[PDB]
Amino acid sequence: SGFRKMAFPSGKVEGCMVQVTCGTTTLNGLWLDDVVYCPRHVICTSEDMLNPNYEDLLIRKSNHNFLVQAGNVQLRVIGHSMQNCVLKLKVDTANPKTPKYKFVRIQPGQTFSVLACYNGSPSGVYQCAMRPNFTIKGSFLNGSCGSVGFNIDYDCVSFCYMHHMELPTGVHAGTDLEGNFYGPFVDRQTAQAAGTDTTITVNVLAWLYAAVINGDRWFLNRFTTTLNDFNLVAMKYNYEPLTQDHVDILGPLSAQTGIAVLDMCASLKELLQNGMNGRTILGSALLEDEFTPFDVVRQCSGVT
Amino acid sequence: SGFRKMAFPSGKVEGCMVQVTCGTTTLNGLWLDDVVYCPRHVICTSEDMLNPNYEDLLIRKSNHNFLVQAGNVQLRVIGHSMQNCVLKLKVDTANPKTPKYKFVRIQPGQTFSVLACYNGSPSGVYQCAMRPNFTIKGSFLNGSCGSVGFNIDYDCVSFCYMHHMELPTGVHAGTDLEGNFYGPFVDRQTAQAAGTDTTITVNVLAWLYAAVINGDRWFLNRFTTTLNDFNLVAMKYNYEPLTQDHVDILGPLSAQTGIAVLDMCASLKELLQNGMNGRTILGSALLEDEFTPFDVVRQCSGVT
Ligand SMILES: CS(=O)(=O)c1ccc(N2CCNCC2)cc1
Ligand SMILES: CS(=O)(=O)c1ccc(N2CCNCC2)cc1
Numbered sequence: 080s081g082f083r084k085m086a087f088p089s090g091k092v093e094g095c096m097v098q099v100t101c102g103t104t105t106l107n108g109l110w111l112d113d114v115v116y117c118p119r120h121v122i123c124t125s126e127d128m129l130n131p132n133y134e135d136l137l138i139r140k141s142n143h144n145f146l147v148q149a150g151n152v153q154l155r156v157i158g159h160s161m162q163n164c165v166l167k168l169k170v171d172t173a174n175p176k177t178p179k180y181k182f183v184r185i186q187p188g189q190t191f192s193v194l195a196c197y198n199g200s201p202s203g204v205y206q207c208a209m210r211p212n213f214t215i216k217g218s219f220l221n222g223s224c225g226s227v228g229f230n231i232d233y234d235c236v237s238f239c240y241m242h243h244m245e246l247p248t249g250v251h252a253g254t255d256l257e258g259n260f261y262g263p264f265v266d267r268q269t270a271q272a273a274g275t276d277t278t279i280t281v282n283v284l285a286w287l288y289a290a291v292i293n294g295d296r297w298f299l300n301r302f303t304t305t306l307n308d309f310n311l312v313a314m315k316y317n318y319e320p321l322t323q324d325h326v327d328i329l330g331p332l333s334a335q336t337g338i339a340v341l342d343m344c345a346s347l348k349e350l351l352q353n354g355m356n357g358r359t360i361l362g363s364a365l366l367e368d369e370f371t372p373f374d375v376v377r378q379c380s381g382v383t
Numbered sequence: 384s385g386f387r388k389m390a391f392p393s394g395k396v397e398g399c400m401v402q403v404t405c406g407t408t409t410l411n412g413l414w415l416d417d418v419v420y421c422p423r424h425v426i427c428t429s430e431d432m433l434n435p436n437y438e439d440l441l442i443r444k445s446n447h448n449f450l451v452q453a454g455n456v457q458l459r460v461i462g463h464s465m466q467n468c469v470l471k472l473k474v475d476t477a478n479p480k481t482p483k484y485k486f487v488r489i490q491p492g493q494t495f496s497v498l499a500c501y502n503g504s505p506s507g508v509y510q511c512a513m514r515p516n517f518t519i520k521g522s523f524l525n526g527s528c529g530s531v532g533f534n535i536d537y538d539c540v541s542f543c544y545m546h547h548m549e550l551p552t553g554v555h556a557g558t559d560l561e562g563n564f565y566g567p568f569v570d571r572q573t574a575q576a577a578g579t580d581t582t583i584t585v586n587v588l589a590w591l592y593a594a595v596i597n598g599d600r601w602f603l604n605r606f607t608t609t610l611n612d613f614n615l616v617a618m619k620y621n622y623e624p625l626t627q628d629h630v631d632i633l634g635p636l637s638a639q640t641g642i643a644v645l646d647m648c649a650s651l652k653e654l655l656q657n658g659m660n661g662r663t664i665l666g667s668a669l670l671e672d673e674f675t676p677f678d679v680v681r682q683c684s685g686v687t
């Protein structure tokens with residue numbers, strides 16, 4: 080028993096991290112097969128970031144200007160290309176530690192682990208969620224660009240995020256591994272304000288199910304609600320609307336606990352309206368939304 | 384910027400996890416050099432756990448009764464011995480993935496990462512603290528025994544914990560890698576109640592410093608206090624007493640932020656007396672105590 084914010088074991092991704100330097104900029108790259116992926120802003124100086132023309136800046140770069148180092152050994156760059164906001168550096172050596180992998184573009188509400196790196200060296204691993212406004216609340220200092228987000232299914236790593244930017248509000252923006260930003264963000268140092276950071280309702284309900292499974296049951300009430308009634312309260316509290324797809328996804332947690340999804344919605348509704356009253360749920364004084372229903376099932380069953 | 388509960392990259396420890404089976408029990412082992420370390424309760428049936436005599440149970444076991452599997456390959460056991468509450472299984476093959484390592488016994492308040500494993504397979508990584516009552520609040524299902532806690536200093540892994548027990552209250556107990564339990568706990572299925580789970584004051588202060596560095600400054604007040612005055616309030620709120628050693632340890636955070644340690648103590652004192660008033664600090668509605676001052680410095684500087 081016990082319920083923790085857990086990240087995937089990072090070993091498979093650690094074997095892919097490399098350091099990429101272009102001029103005076105050093106950031107992280109992801110080495111899979113004979114390609115190194117990194118943010119295209121590696122070619123920008125701090126000055127260029129204010130209004131960069133990436134195609135024009137890239138013309139002044141040749142293969143030998145991209146310095147790729149894996150551990151303390153240099154990789155030979157034999158090609159380079161820009162795909163959206165990522166650069167793909169073809170190297171002459173396939174990464175011997177390349178795991179089975181996929182590139183996936185996640186939806187808001189989905190969680191993933193981030194391996195924060197500096198100079199191609201992993202420093203830490205944490206668990207995140209793609210917010211409904213397409214930002215992530217990460218922990219990234221200068222030099223962390225190119226650090227990646229991923230999920231693991233047994234032995235296959237699905238890479239879903241690459242770190243690019245920090246908005247003026249301290250929240251983070253990045254791309255999938257095809258170089259397309261999540262949300263409306265651009266790799267330019269300009270006014271980019273995030274939209275409403277709503278709460279991921281289906282994730283909160285999943286976490287309330289985890290709480291019940293782990294013994295924290297004080298919040299369970301004698302009420303029920305409907306999807307429409309619940310959603311009126313959810314809109315008022317800046318919670319994402321709950322759909323029948325979400326109810327279907329919570330089905331196994333409902334079955335395991337014997338608590339109908341709409342009953343849990345009514346408990347959540349009273350928690351929103353009454354507050355926690357100084358109490359905690361799974362050691363938290365607020366409603367946690369960075370566990371998906373899949374995460375709750377995985378952690379509560381022990382998927383390796 | 385941004386501040387996350389971060390675990391160390393788990394790769395170096397993943398390469399050490401093996402599956403140990405003795406009779407009908409399968410749990411995790413840690414393979415370092417030619418020794419596999421695992422909880423000695425691997426020799427117990429669920430019935431034996433009620434009142435086990437480990438020396439007597441171990442007499443009925445031979446080297447060939449301990450089945451050690453690393454990946455899908457079997458290791459040959461050429462010796463076995465009991466050291467406190469851990470079994471050391473000598474194998475004929477040194478782990479080729481053995482990192483540089485130390486065995487350390489941590490003090491309460493110290494944090495570490497746990498690589499939760501099942502059947503010798505890593506399922507997740509999370510960050511923990513040794514509580515002042517010598518329990519840990521982990522996430523461990525049946526089959527997780529033998530999962531380990533560690534800290535990494537560049538390339539050296541300091542193993543500090545091995546999971547053994549879950550108390551009837553759902554909190555966890557375990558040993559250092561010499562087999563000595565943290566706290567008064569024993570590897571027997573009997574009434575073992577934990578003492579007071581007090582808050583790790585020096586860790587809360589470190590985290591308030593992290594909050595200031597990351598822009599969350601609402602809680603800073605116009606007051607100061609003394610160690611003795613602060614400690615009177617800390618005792619009342621079940622917080623650990625703050626010592627001059629703790630003040631010394633917070634010195635670099637005080638220097639970086641320009642906020643004297645005793646001033647931060649006065650802010651913490653008002654947070655204890657007034658509460659959060661529905662506000663959050665670093666996305667938390669309660670005062671976080673599972674970041675040491677060292678962790679705050681490491682995360683805020685980018686140590687890899
Ligand atoms: C606006 S920001 O803080 O997200 C940001 C600003 C600058 C950069 N650099 C790219 C690498 N070359 C140096 C400049 C990257 C991100
Ligand atoms: C009291 S408890 O839940 O912490 C616990 C109970 C039993 C066990 N087993 C050891 C391995 N063999 C089967 C029994 C381990 C821990």
